[PDB]
TrEMBL record:
Mg(2+) binds at E86, H87, S90. Keywords: Heme, Iron, Metal-binding. Signal peptide: none annotated. It comes from Hypoxylon sp. (strain EC38). The keyword Ribonucleoprotein does not apply. Glycans are attached at N110, N138. This is Cloroperoxidase. Heme b binds at C16, H87, S90, L91, S92.
Length: 228
């Protein structure tokens, strides 16, 4: 069990699979509480080689979720608060309207898996999966909404599971690694994952975000499908 411990009764968790994974490995506080900018830089750096500028940028948004105004920390359960960073049309979570939006949800992940159509997820598969969730949530959730910020996140999130868990150059990621991260909230070291030697930058996230958009082929955009 050396290196990873399931959360326990007093630990808090996020709607984010990576942050939950890093807390479980202890890159972050295992109780998912008291996460500061320096602890975010150090954990994302140590585990994943996220550069400081990106770590700092994500910290910024994370802080806005702490009920206390102008907070210097956040707990993982702050991220679950609906319509700040938590958005509808997640890949692994249900819309808050149906039930809790923070934990893994087999039904919703089943939909997303079905749009990952080979052993290797590429930008096209990633982009398709997100599209179907946006539309499926628009046509089933009467309170379906997605802020400019939420759209930006939703795109960023699909960009992240490729760029950060996979190879950003080729902009591909084995399906097995993504399924494992989502279903175990544990880095898939044993399936081949290795901390990349080259840092993952704000710019790397933007480039993949743009590749996700450019692989959306609507004849007519049905609502917020490209907003950043
Ligand atoms: C401080 C850093 C981070 C913050 C504050 C953060 C925050 C969030 C939040 C609030 C969500 C939930 C949105 C929703 O689906 O309703 C989320 C989802 C997600 N995050 Fe993160 N995250 C961080 C880092 C990362 C990293 C490093 C990765 C990937 C390697 C990542 C991958 C994802 C993915 C794939 C989702 C989508 C889950 C889903 O749609 O079911 N995040 N993150
Ligand atoms: C998800 O898919 C599996 C097939 O892998 C099925 O057994 C399970 O019941 C599905 N869950 C839902 C709620 O559709
Ligand atoms: C949901 O559906 C309608 C299309 O009927 C569209 O006007 C609206 O912009 C969509 N909402 C979002 C947030 O994408
Ligand atoms: Mg959600």
């Amino acid at each position: 069990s050396s290196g990873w411990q399931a959360p326990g009764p007093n630990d808090v968790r996020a709607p984010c699979p990576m942050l939950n994974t890093l807390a479980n490995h202890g890159f972050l506080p295992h109780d998912g509480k008291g996460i500061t900018v320096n602890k975010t830089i150090d954990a994302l750096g140590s585990a994943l080689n996220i550069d400081a500028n990106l770590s700092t940028l994500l910290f910024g948004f994370a802080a806005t979720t702490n009920p206390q105004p102008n907070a210097t920390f956040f707990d993982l359960d702050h991220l679950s608060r609906h319509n700040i960073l938590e958005h509808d049309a997640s890949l692994s979570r249900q819309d808050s309207y149906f039930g809790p939006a923070d934990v893994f949800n087999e039904a919703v992940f089943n939909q997303t898996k079905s749009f990952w159509t080979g052993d290797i997820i590429d930008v096209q598969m990633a982009a398709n999966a997100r599209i179907v969730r946006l539309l499926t949530s628009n046509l089933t959730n009467p309170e379906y909404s997605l802020s400019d910020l939420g759209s930006a996140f939703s795109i960023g999130e699909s960009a992240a599971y490729i760029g950060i868990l996979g190879d950003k150059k080729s902009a591909t990621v084995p399906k097995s690694w993504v399924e494992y991260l989502f279903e175990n909230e544990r880095l898939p070291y044993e399936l081949g994952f290795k901390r990349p030697n080259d840092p993952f930058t704000t710019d790397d996230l933007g480039d993949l975000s743009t590749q996700i958009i450019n692989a959306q082929h609507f004849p007519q955009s049905p609502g917020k499908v490209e907003k950043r």
